[PDB]
Amino acid sequence: NVHTFRGINGHNSSSSL
């Protein structure tokens, strides 16, 4: 979920093509 789980590491590699 958006409110509880942030996602620092997940966005740093998935959003980087």
Task: For residues 10 and 15, give the distance between their C-alpha atoms in angstroms, rounded to a whole number.
Answer: 8
Query: Which residue has tokens 């509880």?
Result: 4
Residue type, 17: L
Phi then psi dihedrals of residue 15, to 5 deg: -70, -15
Helices (H) and strands (E) in the chain, counts: 1, 0
Query: Which residue has tokens 């740093």?
Result: 12
Q: What was the experiment behind these coordinates?
A: NMR
Three-state DSSP state, 11 = helix
DSSP code, position 2: T
Element (H, E) at 13: helix 8-14
